[PDB]
Write a protein that binds this ligand. Structure first.
Ligand SMILES: CC1=C([C@@H]2C[C@H](C)C(=O)O2)CC[C@]23CCCN=C2CC/C=C(\C)[C@@H]2O[C@@H](CC[C@H](O)/C(C)=C/[C@@H]13)C[C@H]2C
Ligand SMILES: CC1=C([C@@H]2C[C@H](C)C(=O)O2)CC[C@]23CCCN=C2CC/C=C(\C)[C@@H]2O[C@@H](CC[C@H](O)/C(C)=C/[C@@H]13)C[C@H]2C
Ligand SMILES: CC1=C([C@@H]2C[C@H](C)C(=O)O2)CC[C@]23CCCN=C2CC/C=C(\C)[C@@H]2O[C@@H](CC[C@H](O)/C(C)=C/[C@@H]13)C[C@H]2C
Ligand SMILES: CC1=C([C@@H]2C[C@H](C)C(=O)O2)CC[C@]23CCCN=C2CC/C=C(\C)[C@@H]2O[C@@H](CC[C@H](O)/C(C)=C/[C@@H]13)C[C@H]2C
Ligand SMILES: CC1=C([C@@H]2C[C@H](C)C(=O)O2)CC[C@]23CCCN=C2CC/C=C(\C)[C@@H]2O[C@@H](CC[C@H](O)/C(C)=C/[C@@H]13)C[C@H]2C
Lengths: 213, 212, 212, 216, 215
């Protein structure tokens, strides 16, 4: 019967209620309860390289994945619901930031995440980013090389650790008719040491080598 | 008192729907939703050959049906139909896949709800998307394409469809810098490595050239 | 100390109207609302022939009248009108049909409600819209038009009219880059193959040229 | 231990005062013909950033001083441990709807939107703004320069509800940017009255007239 | 077995809850309760120098630091937690403003502060700022000199004592491939009085000498 649809809605509603409007929520990672965030970029386009200001504009998808015990559930208690979509405001998200942007990142996609019964969150914002990049050599065979680091703004490696599944930037969705073609693009986790601080900070360094098509 | 009874019936209905009964948490695998999508292309504003971006203005017609929004007009003084702010209901997360700037909304964010639980939502939008306008200065013109789909829902939660593969050009701006040779909107089913579920988009293909 | 009671009188009035009473949920077929619309054209700021976009600054006068906003001044210390945030009341969704960028509001979003139930709301706006400015550098000038109308209501709900078909030019900026040769605002009735209901818009037609 | 004991008492008093003003008393409904308000307006001109002769728009940067007084914001400092004034977000109080009448773009606020309220009920509010307004800069490349003007007034209130006032007709140029592309020859702010056919009430504005030339 | 982690989260929720729900929140600095705010700059890039409007665009990190008794806790009472991060909207923050910006500041970093057990708040927004600056001489060896002041918009020196750790601007992460190189950058505390009024107003003057790069 079509009543099974009404039972599906009630089960989701109760699940969300149990995880948000009842269970003690998430204050962010701690030194004793650290969090690993998996990061990966899908480079869609180099829109603009500005040699009068040394800014380059990228469009990319930033894939983020982390896992919380306070988001786990048994699907058997909720009509075998295995995953659900929720607004990215309802849950805690990591403060992953580009370290050398020259204006605020523009969000191209709806700020919605996917939560899975094991406590997995997948969040993949499409973004347009202006960052510090000298495009000298872009009109040559060798091309120009630029880099931008992404990491937490406020957490050290003892609270947020970063990892990549791979060192290769996903280029399978690169705009085939861009003004610029990619010679190579890598994403490398770096354990970074600052003079201020005994504890290391983790970033992912995005190195893009490119030239005019 | 004729007016006052029709206003009270509307406020009662909106209450029953939006102060009860109880909520709507989006589509699921067991409770999937059909969103029908259609485009009315008004203008190609700008084709920047220095960055390969093209700016479109269009209306995006979205229609879907929720049982939680159904009512019997007989219970509410023959109200078959009402207007509501789009912030007050669930709407689908239909997104352009290759935009270069956040989409800019041109129209009031208001939807119409019919007693059959059907929702009609038609935002007007300006979109910048990835498009190489090479050839636009010629008789063959340039061809550009952009896909629209849910960002987060798969084909098992939202079934995207169209009523036609023909973009509505009946209000394309007659004095645009660009004339439309053709504009089509096509449903495609796509799979990604990570994931068993299908993902559905509508591909909008526009062929265009500079107006004489 | 009437100054103290003057405040409590207005406080009580706003309470009685916004609380106490059944809410006004907008117009319906059962209860159509006449909305009067008129433009005061202040400046043609910019005419872009690369994109066929023209930028206007104008005041958009909106006027309508409601039973649920009427009161007797004697009951409220001789108060005959009050100011209120436009966010606190229903306002009409009058939209440019061919803008190219979201309209930018230049004035505080505040309306004036009078005891006879009439609302005055006059947003100052900057609008980019579809206009071919060819011939602006000549004596005959260029001619462009843009239609304003409700996005979601038909003529059965919003009975849209103008008080005059002449655009107010009494404060068009005397040192503008462009001079106005004429500006008219004309109500039109249109029909669509979806809908039995008539649809109404106001067509702002501006003829203009480079000042010399 | 009268260290952070005085400090605790002073913090508690401040929070007691704000609570007594913004919770124990009904929300201020704005001025009326029987309870009218006088807003005192003065400008501090900081910079003429740009003069665009292809659109006839000029961009100004200035501080707009606004001051007014309300009985509902008065208090006795003795009942609140000698507190004479406090700072508050502009959003937590009523502020007048003073608007430029010939802007071509929405004003951009450069400063934090915070006001200062004094025990006599007076409020000081000084937002820094960038403004694009209608201005023909022909003459800017001359000795007498170019002259432009922009009126400021309430958008929805007549002079019977919000009266507008200046302390002086001289614009404050003591903070004008000395390396600006444009130098100021004069800047005045003059109160004006008129009537409209709609209404019997006087309508008031302050006309900011600026005379300027290219600095060389 | 090991869910002393449960727990670790419980301790932090309890702490934030104790500081934000069970104790009176700070109402801001006052005459009788003045605050010391320490301000410091890390210059990242001079993006753009516009000679037709006399505007220059800077990207910098603005270090802000202050200390409240009401944000102190005993780490022993909360499972040894010595610090936590929290949205900047949750706490009071200083209204430090550039005095000569020509566009509203743009924040580039998430608005999150770090609070330590002694009542310390560290808050470091990355910002892009357009300000008033005549870049004449930027194409020469001497370079051009520009300056911009930062201070409280609404508080006098009787409520906020503005301070620096040092007069040298941090250049250790200045973008090496910038269009402009830095010759010098100083941050100086200034006390000003206005004929208007008896209270002093404190600011930090950022003075940057810079020129076009020749790399
Ligand atoms: C210098 C610095 C960089 C530099 C900038 C350049 C593009 C780069 O690659 O690393 C990236 C952002 C980062 C390094 C990564 C962590 N965050 C910042 C700036 C924000 C710092 C905050 C909020 C507080 O100071 C942090 C340590 C202070 C440290 O000296 C500091 C300011 C580091 C910051 C920890 C935290 C308590
Ligand atoms: C690669 C990709 C595209 C590409 C871009 C190009 C224009 C195209 O045609 O498809 C459009 C958006 C989409 C495909 C359509 C659905 N969403 C995305 C990106 C957002 C993805 C989110 C939130 C989650 O990851 C998805 C994994 C699928 C896949 O690897 C992935 C990131 C697909 C995304 C499932 C979903 C739970
Ligand atoms: C085609 C159309 C135009 C055109 C564009 C051109 C400048 C013109 O003159 O009219 C302007 C906006 C309008 C004109 C009529 C009112 N609204 C629209 C688009 C928005 C429509 C919505 C939200 C729903 O469809 C409406 C009827 C559908 C109709 O075919 C339709 C799409 C009309 C729209 C009613 C309402 C339930
Ligand atoms: C004509 C006009 C101007 C003109 C524009 C030019 C730069 C000037 O100096 O005055 C600036 C804004 C103002 C002048 C006075 C303040 N209001 C406006 C526009 C907004 C008006 C509203 C909301 C209602 O009409 C007002 C009076 C009607 C009057 O004819 C009217 C529309 C005046 C408006 C009062 C109020 C009830
Ligand atoms: C004149 C002035 C400047 C100028 C600009 C130039 C770069 C400079 O060094 O000082 C920068 C901002 C400041 C100086 C420091 C305090 N803030 C302002 C402007 C905002 C002032 C407000 C909100 C109220 O008046 C303040 C004191 C009045 C004082 O005369 C005044 C208007 C000072 C303001 C305190 C407060 C109650």
């Amino acid at each position: 019967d079509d009543d099974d649809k009404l039972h599906s809605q009630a089960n989701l509603m109760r699940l969300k209620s149990d995880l948000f409007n009842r269970s003690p929520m998430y204050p962010g990672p701690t030194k004793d309860d650290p969090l690993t965030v998996t990061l990966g970029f899908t480079l869609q386009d180099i829109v603009k390289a500005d040699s009068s200001t040394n800014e380059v504009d990228l469009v990319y998808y930033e894939q983020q994945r982390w896992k919380l015990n306070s988001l786990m559930w048994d699907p058997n208690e909720y009509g075998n619901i295995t995953d659900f979509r929720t607004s990215a405001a309802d849950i805690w998200t990591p403060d992953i930031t580009a370290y050398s942007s020259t204006r605020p990142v523009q969000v191209l996609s709806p700020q919605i995440a996917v939560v899975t019964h094991d406590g997995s969150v997948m969040f993949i914002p499409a973004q347009r980013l202006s960052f510090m990049c000298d495009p000298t050599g872009v009109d040559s065979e060798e091309g120009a090389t630029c880099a931008v680091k992404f990491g937490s703004w406020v957490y050290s490696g003892f609270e947020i650790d970063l990892k990549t599944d791979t060192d290769q930037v996903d280029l399978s969705s690169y705009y085939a008719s861009s003004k610029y073609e990619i010679l190579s693009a890598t994403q490398t986790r770096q354990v970074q040491h600052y003079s201020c601080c005994p504890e290391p900070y983790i970033d992912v360094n995005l190195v893009v080598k490119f030239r005019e098509r």
